[PDB]
Nucleic acid binder design. Sequence first.
RNA 1: CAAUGGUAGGAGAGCGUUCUAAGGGCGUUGAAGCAUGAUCGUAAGGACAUGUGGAGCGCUUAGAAGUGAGAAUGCCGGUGU
RNA 2: GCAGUAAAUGUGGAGCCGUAGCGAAAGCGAGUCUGAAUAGGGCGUUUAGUAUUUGGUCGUAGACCCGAAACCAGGUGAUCU
RNA 3: GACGACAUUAGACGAAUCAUCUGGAAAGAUGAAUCAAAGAAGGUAAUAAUCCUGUAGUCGAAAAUGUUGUCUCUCUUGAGUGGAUCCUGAGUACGACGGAGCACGUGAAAUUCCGUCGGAAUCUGGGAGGACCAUCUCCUAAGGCUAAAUACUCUCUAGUGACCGAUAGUGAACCAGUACCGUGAGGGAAAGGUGAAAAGCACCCCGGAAGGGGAGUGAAAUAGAACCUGAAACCGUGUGCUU
Lengths: 64, 146, 206, 58
Amino acid sequence: PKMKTHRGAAKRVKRTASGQLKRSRAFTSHLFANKSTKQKRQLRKARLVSKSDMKRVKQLLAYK
Amino acid sequence: MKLHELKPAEGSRKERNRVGRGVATGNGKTSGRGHKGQKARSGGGVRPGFEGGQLPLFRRLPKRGFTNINRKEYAIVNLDQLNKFEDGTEVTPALLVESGVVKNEKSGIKILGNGSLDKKLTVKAHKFSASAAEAIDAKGGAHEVI
Amino acid sequence: ANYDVLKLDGTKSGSIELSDAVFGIEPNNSVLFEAINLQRASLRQGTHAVKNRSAVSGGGRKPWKQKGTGRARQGTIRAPQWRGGGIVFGPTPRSYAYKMPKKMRRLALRSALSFKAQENGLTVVDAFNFEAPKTKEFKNVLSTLEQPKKVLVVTENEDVNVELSARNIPGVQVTTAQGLNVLDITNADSLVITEAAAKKVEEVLG
Amino acid sequence: KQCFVTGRKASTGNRRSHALNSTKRRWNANLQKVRILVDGKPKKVWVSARALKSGKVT
RNA sequence: CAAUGGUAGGAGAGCGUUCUAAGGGCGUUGAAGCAUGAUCGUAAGGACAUGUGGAGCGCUUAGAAGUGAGAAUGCCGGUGU
RNA sequence: GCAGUAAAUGUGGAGCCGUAGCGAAAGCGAGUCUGAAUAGGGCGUUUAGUAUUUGGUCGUAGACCCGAAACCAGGUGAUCU
RNA sequence: GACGACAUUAGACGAAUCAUCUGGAAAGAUGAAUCAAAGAAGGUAAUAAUCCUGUAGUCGAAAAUGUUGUCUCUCUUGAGUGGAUCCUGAGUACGACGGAGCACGUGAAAUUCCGUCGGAAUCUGGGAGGACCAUCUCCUAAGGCUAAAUACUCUCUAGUGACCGAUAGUGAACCAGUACCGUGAGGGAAAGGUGAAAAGCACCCCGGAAGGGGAGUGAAAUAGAACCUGAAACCGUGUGCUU
């Protein structure tokens, strides 16, 4: 039948123009007293899903 | 071409790989699945995204954002896509449809500015960008927002 | 371009002009092949079906205990290795038909028709005017028109008497101008088109 | 065991726990045995206490 | 002029079995099977002759698959020690 | 869907994908987001896509075959004990 | 009830071929014809459009049915305008508690149902528009009936299949849910093929018989009833070369 989508993932990544996936960052919910001011604005950004992981999740987000 | 001498297009067809039929084929005994483990079993393999119990990527990462259930996104027509019309002519949402420059009209029409007119004509659309407005007027011609 | 119009007798009457965008293109053998394969596959009915290990009668009891007997471990008398057991992955009821883009379907009818016009197998006749169904007479028409054992006759709309006359001549099929199909034009070694059907086929296919 | 008048009868559902563990349960009507006037002759029958809230003659 | 051991494994080219479409053929002046033979190709394999056999079957091109067995203390049937 | 022979095929333009992206979003647009910034950085902008199909994989299906210890529902049985 | 109309549970008619060759027999081969609204198909001593049953086409019911045109027949009020009053579905809506249902896991949780307690309005009213309200828009609950498009095939009728050909295809082509097994629920097989025609071997010989060997039937009897073809494992009898 029609293949489904990892709804848990569709809420975490936006698809970018060259087919990349823009992801949000980790280590950013609490315990900020234990992280530096440098770590915090360099975590206030967006990175791209790495090619290693992409090869593992290509189909979980095929319809995005 | 005759029905008893036909030929398929070159390189268009290929015989598929039957598995588990003799050693000479190169996929004889284990059928290309290695020796043991889940990969070697029927209906085996592992669910995609699974990482051997390591926390999967898409739970290491946080969700963000929402969806504005009511978006106004428009079928866009570029500046250079308007030089398929003529001089002094009038462009309208439905002319952008008969000529076939816009298929679905989404929630309206929006003129953006990329190329050039080489023309002088009036228009009538739903929304405009600055550069689009400026470039309709340099050559002359109005833009009656509807 | 200009094909000779003959009478049912074979004597030249007039001349007609069929375009080269319909009866004179270069045949795409890649598109014509894919179209023939399509038609041949849409004729399959696919009513093959066997029974697996769930549909064979009975077979629910472990035939003997798992350990202790000296026999191989078995779980049902209807397993695939057993005489009388379920089939693994055989035929299932299915269809075999597919589709091609519309424009490609049109280049395949034109290619068959253009192939026919290259091999000189397109005889445009003016009309047929048969008033009663009689097979000896259609056989005559074809022999006086020197048409090969295999010919496809094309009328304008349904011509009842022309159809009832060629149903039994072995090797002749009768078709309307709209019901032209590739498998039929490509089997036929010769064609015989009514001038009205010839102008209709030029309008539709180009 | 229905109410003679309305029909209020029993119904099944779930007993759910703090951990949302489910067990099947039932809900019965407050059926009371009352002598009412049926088919002329007085007769004892089960009738709900909501049907006796207003309307029944014992 | 250089290269050619090879297992898990990747790639390519192919040989065979049944059926279908078309074309072209063979068949009581003996088909398919079966048996024998000292024959041909690089291999999967292909012919030819002679016997038994008493009716179907090849070849070319292309399509589809219940397509290839030596092992599963495999299943069924025969026959051994 | 409708017509047609359980064919081709004809018709049917709801839809779908592409021609634009960026942002959580409002929005803005060959840019946009962040930012006080006209700075820097992120992602973009140099058109090529799309329909059907052969092949390779993957998902959902028992999904390469065989094989448990076992679980649950409805029935049969105190002629042995 | 009373008249018709096609269709369906028997059926009827239905074109056109002869000769030679090989053969046990031709439908084959060869030559010369013919019909076709019929060259679908199955038979026939081999492979048949013209031999047979049929096919295309046409025709056809005493009756007993579905079906349908009508004729009856049986039923029977259609509107507007005011609007002062009146009426418009109660233990109901709805709320609380516990549950269930909504794609929606109690959640901001609408919309909706069940059990348990409460419990309303009557147009100057009531419900809905996903907590929600105010306003707007839509609707008018708590009584009832309703064909079509839709799902399925124990059957029956006609037909189709790049579906299977006897370890397959039904478990079952064959007196099969039967031998058989079990106390019982239940489980559950194996087994088609002489030839064209039975022409199924008159008599004789050995033998008690089973068998056999002649003769005869047949194209063929290593086609003789366990009967078409008859592989391999396996068992024999000879021997050329070896030990």
